[PDB]
């Protein structure tokens, strides 16, 4: 979560692996009609509850698309079409921290040889420094999330870990990402907080582990 | 969420009013990046318990990227890239079924003047047909959907309601040709309604099931 940008400047936006446009043309109950959405891929997160630490892990980092749409709340115009010319420069613009957001550990679905299960272990090691397998993993939900723009589906994920397990690094591969152990104590005030900025996953994951794991512990 | 879905095809969208991808660059620990994200307005959900038959309102609709995503699970390609020789027939296709979803109401935060409460009353009147006033919005959370795509914020509400002010039909606004069903979910059976896997549900109808009976259900008896 380094806080740290300089030169934001929003360009054109032609081809991508992670945002395909596409048009669904289709008759429902006979009338017809179509529906421009984004091809995008599936994901997983996972919630780690470390018991030596009395704390669940998170993880914090910069995500362009969150600073991106703050610019455009505090200047509005900001993030209009841009030219053929190249990309515009983001003048007046936001310090890194407008991006900087708390999310659990999350992962894409985008390669075909790795199942849900270890795509969560992989993005765990790399991301939280901790040594996970799929065995010790557990399935909380699998929802969709943003129907109105994608059909991806995302699986939440729960486990267990000790300091044991912390047998190295996060920090992305070297990507720059700041690992958070929350106390149970402050979870839910910082769950509530809206000065923070947390995603909906974080909100349910810190919910959950209260409420239904947290009172059978011990 | 009429489940009849005929003729369901994929076409390349080469231009759209409502799409709006961007690509942000930007220095980080000085090493050149770039991102690509698309540009969304932010939204509102709000979760209604209706008291007199004690059940949540809900929303049920058919979400065409839902659809065509579940298409895409179980028949990978079918949404691979569309050439010029126009749009390319789903062949094989799933029932409308697989993109039907339960959903809470939501809306956008796009008509000036109008606050967040606001906005969410006026799309519980144009979906679920309740009158609600905005100073009765109990605020649950406000958070960043889908922070790797894109920069919209949504925030929830919470507010109960009697049959009394179901004043309004549902269905949506019949302008965008919208088909949303509103359903009741009784509450001795609702944490068994978001544990099932054998519904689409988002994640804001899985904490707002968790919510209600963990923050507001005790405190009604
Ligand atoms: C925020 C989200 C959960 O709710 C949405 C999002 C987009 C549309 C949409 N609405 N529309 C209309 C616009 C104008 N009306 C008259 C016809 C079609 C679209 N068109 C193409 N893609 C579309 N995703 C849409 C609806 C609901
Ligand atoms: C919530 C999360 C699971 O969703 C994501 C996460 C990352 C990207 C993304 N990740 N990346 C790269 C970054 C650098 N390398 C090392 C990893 C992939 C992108 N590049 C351009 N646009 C992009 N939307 C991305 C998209 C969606
Ligand atoms: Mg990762
Ligand atoms: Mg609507």
């Given at each position: 979560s380094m806080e740290r940008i300089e030169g934001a400047s929003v360009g054109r936006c032609a081809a991508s692996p992670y945002l395909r446009?596409?048009?669904?043309?289709?008759?429902?109950?006979?009338?017809?009609?179509?529906?421009?959405?984004?091809?995008?891929?599936?994901?997983?997160?996972?919630?780690?509850?470390?018991?030596?630490?009395?704390?669940?892990?998170?993880?914090?980092?910069?995500?362009?698309?969150?600073?991106?749409?703050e610019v455009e709340?505090?200047?509005?115009?900001?993030?209009?079409?841009?030219?053929?010319?190249?990309?515009?420069?983001?003048?007046?613009?936001?310090?890194?921290?407008?991006?900087?957001?708390?999310?659990?550990?999350?992962?894409?679905?985008?390669?075909?040889?790795?199942?849900?299960?270890?795509?969560?272990?992989?993005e765990a090691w790399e991301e939280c420094g901790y040594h996970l397998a799929p065995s010790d993993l557990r399935r909380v939900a699998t929802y969709w999330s943003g129907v109105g723009l994608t059909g991806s589906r995302q699986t939440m994920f729960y486990t267990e870990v000790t300091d044991a397990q912390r047998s190295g690094p996060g920090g992305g591969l070297v990507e720059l990402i700041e690992v958070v152990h929350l106390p149970l104590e402050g979870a839910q005030a910082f769950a509530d907080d809206p000065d923070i900025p947390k995603t909906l996953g974080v909100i349910f994951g810190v919910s959950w582990f209260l409420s239904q794991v947290a009172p059978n512990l011990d």
């Open positions: 446009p596409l048009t669904l043309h289709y008759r429902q109950n006979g009338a017809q009609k179509s529906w421009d959405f984004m091809k995008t891929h599936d994901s997983v997160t996972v919630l780690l509850f470390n018991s030596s630490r009395r704390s669940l892990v998170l993880v914090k980092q910069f995500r362009p698309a969150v600073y991106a749409g709340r505090r200047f509005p115009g900001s993030l209009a079409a841009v030219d053929q010319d190249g990309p515009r420069e983001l003048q007046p613009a936001l310090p890194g921290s407008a991006g900087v957001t708390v999310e659990l550990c999350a992962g894409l679905v985008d390669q075909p040889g790795l199942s849900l299960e270890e795509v969560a272990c992989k």
